[PDB]
Amino acid sequence: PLNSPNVYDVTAWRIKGQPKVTAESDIGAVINDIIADIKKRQSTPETRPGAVVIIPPGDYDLHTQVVVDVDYLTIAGFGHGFFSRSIKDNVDTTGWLNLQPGGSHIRVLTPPTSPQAFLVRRDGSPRLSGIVFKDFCLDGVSFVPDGNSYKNGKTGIDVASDNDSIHITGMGFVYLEHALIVRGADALRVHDNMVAECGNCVELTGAGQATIVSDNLMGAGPEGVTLLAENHEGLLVTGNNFFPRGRSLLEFTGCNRCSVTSNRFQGFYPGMMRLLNGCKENLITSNHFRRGTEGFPPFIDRTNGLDDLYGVIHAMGDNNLISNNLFAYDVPPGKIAPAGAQPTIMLIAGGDGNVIATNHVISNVDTQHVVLDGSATRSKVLDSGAASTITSYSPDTAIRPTP
Amino acid sequence: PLNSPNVYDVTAWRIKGQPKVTAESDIGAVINDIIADIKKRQSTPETRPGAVVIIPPGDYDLHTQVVVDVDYLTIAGFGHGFFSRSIKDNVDTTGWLNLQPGGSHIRVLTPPTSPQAFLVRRDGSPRLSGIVFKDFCLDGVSFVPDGNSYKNGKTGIDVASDNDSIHITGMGFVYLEHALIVRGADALRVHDNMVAECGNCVELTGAGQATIVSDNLMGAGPEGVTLLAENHEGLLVTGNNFFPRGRSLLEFTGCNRCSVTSNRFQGFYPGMMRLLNGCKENLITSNHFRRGTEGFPPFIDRTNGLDDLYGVIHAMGDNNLISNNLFAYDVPPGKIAPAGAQPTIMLIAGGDGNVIATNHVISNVDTQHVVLDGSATRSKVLDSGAASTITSYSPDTAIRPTP
Amino acid sequence: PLNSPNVYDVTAWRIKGQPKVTAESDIGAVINDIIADIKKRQSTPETRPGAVVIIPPGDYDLHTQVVVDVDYLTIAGFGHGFFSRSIKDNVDTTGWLNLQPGGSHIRVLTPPTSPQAFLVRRDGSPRLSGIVFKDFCLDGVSFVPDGNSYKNGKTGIDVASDNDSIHITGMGFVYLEHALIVRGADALRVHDNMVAECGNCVELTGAGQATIVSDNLMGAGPEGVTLLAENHEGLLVTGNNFFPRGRSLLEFTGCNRCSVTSNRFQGFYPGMMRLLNGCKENLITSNHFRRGTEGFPPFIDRTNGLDDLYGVIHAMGDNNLISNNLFAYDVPPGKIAPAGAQPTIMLIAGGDGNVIATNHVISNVDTQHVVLDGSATRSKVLDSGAASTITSYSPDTAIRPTP
Ligand SMILES: OC[C@H]1O[C@@](CO)(OC[C@@]2(O[C@H]3O[C@H](CO)[C@@H](O)[C@H](O)[C@H]3O)O[C@H](CO)[C@@H](O)[C@@H]2O)[C@@H](O)[C@@H]1O
Ligand SMILES: OC[C@H]1O[C@@](CO)(OC[C@@]2(O[C@H]3O[C@H](CO)[C@@H](O)[C@H](O)[C@H]3O)O[C@H](CO)[C@@H](O)[C@@H]2O)[C@@H](O)[C@@H]1O
Ligand SMILES: OC[C@H]1O[C@@](CO)(OC[C@@]2(O[C@H]3O[C@H](CO)[C@@H](O)[C@H](O)[C@H]3O)O[C@H](CO)[C@@H](O)[C@@H]2O)[C@@H](O)[C@@H]1O
Ligand SMILES: OC[C@H]1O[C@@](CO)(OC[C@@]2(O[C@H]3O[C@H](CO)[C@@H](O)[C@H](O)[C@H]3O)O[C@H](CO)[C@@H](O)[C@@H]2O)[C@@H](O)[C@@H]1O
Ligand SMILES: OC[C@H]1O[C@@](CO)(OC[C@@]2(O[C@H]3O[C@H](CO)[C@@H](O)[C@H](O)[C@H]3O)O[C@H](CO)[C@@H](O)[C@@H]2O)[C@@H](O)[C@@H]1O
Ligand SMILES: OC[C@H]1O[C@@](CO)(OC[C@@]2(O[C@H]3O[C@H](CO)[C@@H](O)[C@H](O)[C@H]3O)O[C@H](CO)[C@@H](O)[C@@H]2O)[C@@H](O)[C@@H]1O
DSSP, rough: SSOTTTEETTTTOOOBBBTHHHHHHHHHHHHHHOOOOOOHHHHHHSSSOOOOOOOOSSEEEOOOOEEEEEETTTEOSSSOOOOHHHHHHOOOOTOOOOOOSSEEEEEEEOOTOOEEEEEEESSSSOOOEEEEEESOOOEEOOOOSSSSOOOOOOOOEEEEEEESSOESOEEEEESSSSEEEEEEEEEEEEEEEEEEEEEEEEEEEEEEESOOOOOEEEEEOSSSSEEEEEEEEOOOEEEEEOOSSSSHHHHHEBBBBOEEEOOEEEEESSSSSEEEEEESOOEEOOEEEEOOOOHHHHHTTTTOOTTTTSSSEEEESSOEEEESOOOOOOOOOSSSTTOEEEEEEEEEEOOSSEEEEEEEEESOOOOEEEEOOOTTTTTTTEEESSSSGEOOOOOOOOOEEEO | OOTTEEEEETOOOOOOTTTTOOOOHHHHHHHHHHHHHHHHHSSTSSSOOEEEEEEEEEEEEEEEOOOEEEEEEEESSSSOOOOOOHHTSSSOOOOOOOOOOEEEEEEEETTTSSOOOEEOOSSSOOOOOEEEEEEEEEOOOSSSSSSSOOOOHHHHHHHHOOOSSSSEEEOOOEESSSEEEEEEESSSSEEEEEEESSSEHHHHEEEEOOOOEOOOOOEETTTTTEEEESSEEEEESOOOEEEEEEEEEEEEEOOOEEEESOOEEEESOOOEEEEEESOOOOOOEEEEEEOOOSSSSGTTTTOOOOOOTOOOOEEESSOOOSSOOEEOOOGGHHHHHHHOOOOOOEEEEBBBBEEESOOEESSSSSEEEEEEEEBSSSSSEEEOOOOEEEOOTTOOOOOOOOO | OSSTTTTEEETTTTOOTTTTHHHHHHHHHHHHHHHHHHHHHHOOOTTTEEEEEOSEEEEEEEEEEEEOOOTEEEOSOOOOOOHHHHHHHHHHOOOOOSSOOEEEEEEEETTTTTEEEEEEOOOOOEEEEOOOOSSOOOOOOSSSSTTOOOSSSSSEEOOOOOOEEEEESSSSSSSSSSEEEEEEEESOOOEEEEEEESSEEEEEEEEEEEEEESSEEEEEOOOOSEEEEEEEEOOEEEEEEESOOOOOEEEEESSEEEEEOOOOOSSSOOOEEESSSSSOHHHOEEEEEEEEEOOOOTTTOOSSSSTSSSSSEESSSSEEEEEEEEEEOOOOGHHHHHHHHOOEEEEEOOOOOOEEESOEESSSSSSEEEEEOTTTTOEEESSSSHHHHHHESSOEEEEOOOO
16 A cells, blocks of 8 residues: 555455455454564564554454554544434335445444454553554444344443553444443543443543543443543543433543543533542543433433432532533423432532532522532632522532622 | 445545545545435435545645435545644745645635535435444635635535534634534534634524534634634533634524533623623623733734623523633733723623622733623622722622632 | 555555565654655645555554655554663563553654654745644654653654644553654644653643643653643643653643643642643632642652642643632642642732632642732632631732631
């Protein structure tokens, strides 16, 4: 294609010993064979610059899990190819000119025992560095037992060992139980992706440092997470548009000195944002929160099992700044739980020195803008509602009502 | 070029029976012929993954409107090719080594009766999905009758039917009366583009959901819009650098539960930001606003027809949070209208529950930081100026002066 | 490769008369010859659309400085190839599967007479427009005399003449004394790059207009800047993750009406943010600041030579809004200078009308959240700590303590 052996076209690559295998029949086998070719040529610790695998637009079945265990591998298509399988699956498609995702289109047809389309993992040192996934579509094809389960055991990309400077951009993920998982992420960027109609969208697991999640469109399923981070330090979440219907839109557990800023959140259940298990010294600011109710008939009775006293934001930990957010709550009174309760917008479940400053709430019913658990200490609530919209069971919260 | 029939090089493609029609002579006609080839091969609703059209760097005339009516079409160049035709048209260009835009350079030379270079439109179902425009230049060549009119009747890209997951990134738009129009946008991303010296930059018309406009440079013309949204919900506008000389920099009509955060706004006219016709429950926070006067001599006398009492922000609607913004106003008294007027920074023209909080205003003359119309109800003004800079004609406004 | 003479593959280009020079032996010489070919063919101000130079993944030595003096030149690889040379240089690498950066890997071996790998410079007119650097690695190979100096007199990209609409995206910079320099930057976008283990990361010098620095991962050296801007107007710095160990993370000199919003800052020294020499009317908001101490043994005793009274933010200028930020200070008392001092979080070193509002500080020791110099005039401090945490040496500071 170019005059470098480090540039591969999946539609031009022949597997020696399996001449009839195509990118169309099993792109997984083609890419595994390409990776082996790279390893045979790049044979010393000073001769491993990596390579690019090009996926032209087309429909490709992946039956064999790809194991990515080389630094500086780029897998690149020409299009994210997103299509709403959810709407397709639940309406009359008579006369429809298209019935499936496209672009650089990988249909994920992995076996139950190696279900991740791409497994990014290396035993040995150093950390896998500078791997790039961009501009292609990962499509789980169907949910089981029906299209509305958000279950199929499939993952798009699973990074399973400690990693540095991975870049995921311009991707499409659809109808995967898990779109993207990154364990032990350092200096990761999940940037300008379409991640929707997946059980779970982006799971940043184990721990991490110096990560950016920015400019993504994300929508998960009622039993799954949209964005999850575990034990992240210095995670920055900005410019994302999170829409239904994950159990949560942003879920942090043991995350400290992180920032969630300049995002839009739309959710159909309580607990759209969760700072769990002691999240300390985080900035939660300049975000738009919309709590509404399900309007797509196939999901109207679905629930994440939480009631309206849980909070739009549910925070457990110390010294978070929750400031300059707008909350627009509109849930029919017959769909609030428990019956006749005032919904809670921000729940401080516990922790020391949390500050809630300059937040505007609109609700269709009487709501507590802020409830602070009795266990909360040295809390500040500034200009986040009149006295009658703030409930402190904690005896030492300083409250300045909105004048 | 690659071993896929879904990869087209506009410079390699020949129209059978029309050998003199090339990318150079009419790239419009070439791309229409490419799209006819896609439809010929991709002939069922399960065999339409789409294609990529590659535009090498070069100068290409477009005489024939391109009709994009296939999902997952990527039109991709190698460069946005932006050049200030405005400065070129108004100074001595003796010894200049370049006089026009470049990169993947499409010169829009459309007839008055099909004036849009790209018309993205499908009568039928489903919605056009996953179309990508990236890394090329759309150049309308000249404004008439001279370069300073911002008039030529040309559009760069017009999405005229309901769409899902379209991606516009790394583009250059110059000297078009309309750069980009997207009607009925769902999950649209307008990201990291150069949209400047156009009459209008980005018009998101009719309605839309779950859209992101991020990381763009935009400058329009005195009769046109920079960013317009009509009846959008959950529009996120973040990380953009809006400069002159649009009639406005951000104009919403009937937009609800949208967010404008972490942007730079510089304008030379009143009404830089307009929330019009009942915009409700929007977040306007962490933005920098600069109101100056025209410095470029050719435009010194140009105006958008509004006076300095219209507002830097003009808001008509309910329950908006306008907080944590800086306004730098510097207009010579000789250029203020009406003469001797105290300029208004934020005008609440009407509506219920609007909150103005923690805003810093610098002005070269005495200004009212906030003016609230007599019709405004349950308004809050906090820490947005001394008492002498806040004017409420509404009797129920709660005002805390800056200490 | 494509049917355009404006598309160049560095691995396929032969220098006439120098048949032994490959992209591997001296990519600098190959790219200079490509640029000579462009100038041969593109010889009038209406025939200069530019070109793309494609760098396949691989290891390339650059001995010869590239002079970029054409508009709309795109230099594009397929990967940023980042690798921590710093960790490699300071631990036992026995059994390591990789020992250097990769992707589209340019090893910068420039002589001291021409030390910048890419010099972007045109004497003549007009300003260089629309140049794109993307998706390749600039690697200075080693620091002098050892890995921990952050000195080698090498620069990755130096834009030395006035420029418009330059785009730097998806790059990797490692082990350069200066990664990226852009002088007289107009409508520049430094977007989604890895700029790390460089003495200095991004230097925006001389002056500039309408620039965006967004979505970058940056970490510099203790004698150098991470982001520097000189005399910038309307610079937007958003969505960046700045980590150690620059002397500073953000350093402005004479920058006015700029916005630093929605970033993450981690530093190991005082003066993480410096608004020097009359920075006025700047928005510093919705940022997370973490002041810690060095944990990486080779640097434990390295300092930027500043004491803890310098400030996490050091501000010399008028009418800045420093608002809605979180500061997490944790420095062992034995590492605070001078001994027994209260660290300063925000120092107003001088200037008129600065506003400090809605900032949350956590420290391990007694700290002054805000100190205002004797020279500070008409300062305002709101809800940024108790009265005992605010020091005004100035007699005219209006102070509202956190309730
Ligand atoms: O994860 C970020 C980054 O840290 C490195 C070391 O610099 O890895 C540390 C590691 O562990 C941490 O997390 C585990 C589980 O919470 C905890 O037990 C340990 O004390 C922490 O240091 O992070 C991953 C993810 O859990 C682990 O595999 C690893 O031990 C680096 O390798 C990594 O990129
Ligand atoms: O709600 C988001 C969630 O639902 C999915 C379908 O399973 O998408 C629906 C959608 O929005 C609409 O919801 C209904 C269904 O058509 C409609 O009446 C309403 O007007 C829409 O807002 O979500 C996006 C916008 O957020 C639309 O493109 C789409 O119609 C699923 O994709 C998503 O995760
Ligand atoms: O206001 C931006 C608007 O003007 C255009 C030209 O039509 O930009 C011109 C530009 O520079 C010129 O004008 C400035 C003063 O406004 C003057 O200092 C300079 O000498 C002129 O060349 O204006 C900004 C402001 O400095 C510059 O970025 C730009 O070069 C147009 O592109 C834009 O929409
Ligand atoms: O840099 C922004 C933009 O401005 C232009 C003119 O529109 O260049 C002006 C220029 O000078 C300015 O900065 C110098 C030094 O601070 C100052 O003396 C002068 O008064 C300013 O106008 O900016 C560069 C960088 O310093 C100079 O080379 C140039 O004279 C435009 O060319 C440039 O893109
Ligand atoms: O502090 C950032 C600075 O240090 C460099 C190496 O010179 O990177 C280190 C690194 O992180 C850590 O510091 C220690 C040593 O590894 C570790 O204990 C701690 O957990 C990390 O913070 O920086 C990034 C993230 O900040 C990690 O991937 C990396 O290990 C250098 O790259 C950087 O400029
Ligand atoms: O600029 C801060 C930097 O300067 C040092 C001295 O090297 O601190 C001096 C200090 O105080 C003096 O500053 C002002 C006069 O401008 C006045 O408040 C005081 O009386 C002076 O003696 O500067 C700040 C106030 O601006 C004080 O906290 C500090 O003591 C150095 O320690 C510091 O890093």
